[PDB]
Symmetry: C8
């Protein structure tokens, strides 16, 4: 079935490899192995890195990949890196927002600091690309 | 007739559709690229040209003509809780095509009032200004709770 | 010497009628490209400079100008009844007969008489393909009254 | 004499004119490209260089010098219902050359007042700012 | 009485009617100024008085084959002298030459540029900075500013 | 004798070499040696230098590298070059900010000067790329006792 | 009248330019300067671009050495033939080093009376004064000049 | 460990000796070929170092500038520095002494310094650190004149 609370931030190369198999991306196992992609790097993967460093030339294939990564990010356990439980805060707003947890905690944001965050920061620093999402997160952050 | 549940389509249903619209030539590319319903609905000019090998702008226009038809008469119920499809359709039947674009950003009826022109263009993929403006206008004259 | 039929239902034209028109206007040389690219009425009415150069192989700007001269004539005298419920054709024509050529551009965006008042300059240029500023300005002005 | 009806010229008359002005070398290109009166009047720098193969900027300048003459002394009556030709000419004989530019956008005397500087440049092909400004000024005060 | 125009250095004739010059007179002038090397190019391209007066950096480099910026500068130095002392009577009905000359003798060189756009004394008051640069080919800002200033302070009533 | 926090500013080529081995970047030992990277240069290393001069072509590899370097920078002993103890000031704000110490002291900033620092300075001169971090550091700097 | 102290560079011919190149250790470039027909006027107006592309001086360092010599020459040159209003002494009074800008200003037809109206853009683009510090000083002093 | 070296007056030979002392003998040939003397050494840019002197590595350039900054910090500028800007800059911060030649080359002195802008200190005088620019500017506005 579908894995329950995987601790992706603490994943090692081997766990990333397993996940690539499960989602039907075995073709890319070699690249990910050579590049030594662990949990931290997987969560922070960009379009650019995927295309140039991991050899995923097709925009459609990349879209499929990010579709899977988004799913993983949505259901991951962030407890090692998420002391204030931003995951649950984001999830309460909309389950789909949970995917942004690692982006926020990687900049050192927590519940208490969230109120002061700017739109630019959510886009550039936290990697929230959808305006709709940014706006909703911003709004809710100002009112808690 | 029956409206196809394109959001839930798999590669095989996409392959069938390509045949029906006279694009059998492209079946192999779509198979290789593993285009399912979700990816079909979200297909861009760029992806069509570069990743699927549809070099001609005219051919791409023909393709989008067919895709727009499909999108107009698709069943979105699995992914469209608030029934944005009918809201769009009531404005103009041709706007139903934008359903998946809106629900893919997590918009629904309640959130629609707050949407910006930039958001409709960049996030939702509504390319025609005329359409954007009409959708924006009608969204502001909704229920604001 | 005007191509026959006059007052044609270009929106409903198929490849064959496009082919016939190309012959009549002395562009037989391009029949093959139009055939290969499967240009019908709808696509002919929406044809761009870019598509004409790249996809249909009309390399000369002067040849493209000759082509658009003919296409403008066709668009000016075409029957748009199937696709133009609000009769934008007559509205445009009343302003200036030459403006009737913009009918398909306006109806293809889903504009009609009632919506026209709200249209912007950007919309007329980008969405409706009205390239001449003079024309855009006149159409815009008249739209803001109705 | 009588001014030639350049708007109605066919390929053959364009060919004749090229010979007369000493541009015989370009007859073949003009023939291949099927340049008639309408296209001759609307010819751009770009078309002349790329489509007609006139590589030299100096040669193009010589060509436009001849074309401007032709435009200045052409008969526009078929296409110029409101006689913009005479209006332009009265301002400055040299402005008659812009007749076809204006009538091709569907302008006439009555509409002229509403024209903008951008429109005269982009739509009508009036490249000299000085000329644009004078035509604009006079158009607003006939209103 | 600083008249070096009666000097041996200065190309003959003095006060030439350059607007009416034909290829042959252009050829003669090239010889006098030590640009014989370019005679062939100018002949081939059929440069007459009107084209000589209107010549641009671009035409000089690409169409006439003068690849060096320094050589072009030398050329324009000579052309500016010619333009400064030329007779513009055929083309300058309102005597813009004298108007420009009264401001500064070296501004007379702009005469053909101004009359070529259809400027005259009466119209000069309305001229813009853009027009002097793009239409008249006055490249030096200092010159543009002085001409502009003087034009705005003209009596048109 | 072994110190807890390493004195990276005083490191020589040999200590840099050792560190590369420990973090699994032995592959790059040669490049670092040829380029004569010491502690000072290691602390000041940029993306560009890492790619072009040290031959680390992969953006993923560079990310792994900087992940290790950030840790080193966070826990380094800066006492030789940090007379006013900006390290502890930054650390008090957030332990993760200690990584910016060498950036600040390399421009000649100290506690007394910190109040005057601008956003542009923190970005261009000090190399603080994260907006969130800049803003927090800036805020705290303005509200200091001069 | 045989040897002058301050050289009349504006009136120099090719031959005097050639001699100067030899003296400053740039004999290697004599042929290029000869071929390009560089006289005093052109020497004084030489740009970075012309020096690199037309005269073949590829190195930025070599160009810097060249301009170091040219700046000296420009600073001490006699401009009397072309400088009626004595802008040279005006510039010199501000700072001796600013005398090097004389030919740049007189070549645009500036003089003392016109100086008050000059703009920063003009000093940079038309007169070739590249150092902002120099432009600012010249601009400041020019604001206290009397115009007509 | 040179005491007050008169770098502005240095000839090719002294620059060569200096290169040897700092472990850059590899670059002696290029510096010789390009005829780098004291004046050119003090005014050297990243661009000239890369393109004209063949120092391809950014890291090597950084090492070089580290040495040059040291030399500039300890140099005797008396030939070119009549108002003793060197001591004024040094009194502010010993690390500012390195900017002496940049300032005096533009003809600046103690009395003029106040009129300089931040852009001028960057573009004309080659002061790359914003923090340094701002500190020099501030102190210049508050100084005692005659």
């Amino acid at each position: 079935p579908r894995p329950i609370l995987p601790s992706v931030p603490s994943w090692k190369e081997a766990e990333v490899q397993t996940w690539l198999q499960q989602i039907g991306f075995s073709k890319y196992c070699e690249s990910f192995r050579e590049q030594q992609v662990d949990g931290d790097l997987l969560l922070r993967l960009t379009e650019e890195e995927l295309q140039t460093d991991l050899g995923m030339k097709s925009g459609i294939t990349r879209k499929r990949f990010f579709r899977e990564l988004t799913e993983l990010k949505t259901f991951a356990n962030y407890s090692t890196c998420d002391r204030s439980n931003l995951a649950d805060w984001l999830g309460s707003l909309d389950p789909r927002f949970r995917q942004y947890t690692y982006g926020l905690v990687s900049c050192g944001l927590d519940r208490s600091l969230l109120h002061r965050v700017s739109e630019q920061q959510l886009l550039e620093d936290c990697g929230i690309h959808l305006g709709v999402h940014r706006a909703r997160i911003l709004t809710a952050a100002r009112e808690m």
